[PDB]
Amino acid sequence: GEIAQTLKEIAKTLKEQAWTLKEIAQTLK
Amino acid sequence: GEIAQTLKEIAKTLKEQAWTLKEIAQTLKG
Amino acid sequence: GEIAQTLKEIAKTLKEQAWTLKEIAQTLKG
Amino acid sequence: GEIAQTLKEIAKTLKEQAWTLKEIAQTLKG
Amino acid sequence: GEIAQTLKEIAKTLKEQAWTLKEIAQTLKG
Amino acid sequence: GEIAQTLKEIAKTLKEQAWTLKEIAQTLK
């Protein structure tokens, strides 16, 4: 349903954010 | 329902945050 | 109910965070 | 119930994080 | 069940993240 | 369910993000 699809979008976005934070961490290091 | 709509709003907001973080990462890099 | 209200609070807080991240992005540019 | 209480904890923590991010934004700016 | 347990894990992790953000804020300040 | 599995993925991703934030904190320190 809509809820399952929306949660999957949230999961995908958080994974993208996690990768971006890793980029930031690497840049700072 | 209200909960489904609110979760969609959360999803949209998180996507906005993700984009902003990408901008920050790019700015820091160069 | 309580769950829907709590999710709305989460949504509002994430929107606040999103705005703050935009401020940070702007500051880092100069 | 347990889910509602856990979501409330999440909401409170996100609000704390939002305040801390504002502190970071302010520090970076000046 | 699984949902409640998973949300508790999320709550714990977010609390850890909140503390780490406070560390970042403190480092930037001083 | 799909919801429970998606939340587990979210939990794992947030843990990764938490570790990355710690890396950022350490770099700044």
Side-chain angles (χ1 to χ4, degrees), chain A residues 4 7-8 10-11 14 17-18 21-22 24-25 28-29, chain F residues 3 6-7 9-10 13-14 16-17 20-21 23-24 27-28:
Chain A
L7 284 173
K8 283 188 171 86
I10 289 168
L14 287 177
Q17 165 165 312
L21 282 171
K22 281 152 190 144
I24 289 168
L28 290 177
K29 200 180 179 190
Chain F
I3 297 300
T6 302
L7 285 174
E9 292 177 20
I10 289 168
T13 299
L14 288 178
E16 296 171 4
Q17 166 167 314
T20 300
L21 281 171
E23 292 193 321
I24 290 167
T27 296
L28 290 177

Side-chain angles (χ1 to χ4, degrees), chain B residues 2 6 9 13 17 20 24, chain C residues 4 7 14-15 17 21-22:
Chain B
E2 66 178 327
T6 301
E9 190 71 3
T13 299
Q17 290 190 359
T20 302
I24 290 168
Chain C
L7 285 172
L14 288 176
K15 281 181 189 162
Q17 289 190 359
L21 283 171
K22 281 180 163 177

Side-chain angles (χ1 to χ4, degrees), chain B residues 2 4-15 17-18 20-25 27-30:
Chain B
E2 66 178 327
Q5 294 311 296
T6 301
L7 285 171
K8 285 183 207 171
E9 190 71 3
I10 289 167
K12 173 199 169 74
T13 299
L14 287 176
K15 194 172 297 195
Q17 290 190 359
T20 302
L21 281 170
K22 201 167 180 196
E23 192 184 336
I24 290 168
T27 296
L28 290 176
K29 196 162 280 200

Side-chain angles (χ1 to χ4, degrees), chain C residues 1 3-30:
Chain C
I3 286 172
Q5 294 310 297
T6 301
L7 285 172
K8 283 186 187 187
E9 191 159 35
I10 289 168
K12 177 179 189 75
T13 299
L14 288 176
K15 281 181 189 162
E16 169 190 0
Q17 289 190 359
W19 173 271
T20 303
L21 283 171
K22 281 180 163 177
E23 292 185 317
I24 288 168
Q26 173 65 23
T27 294
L28 290 176
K29 290 189 86 290

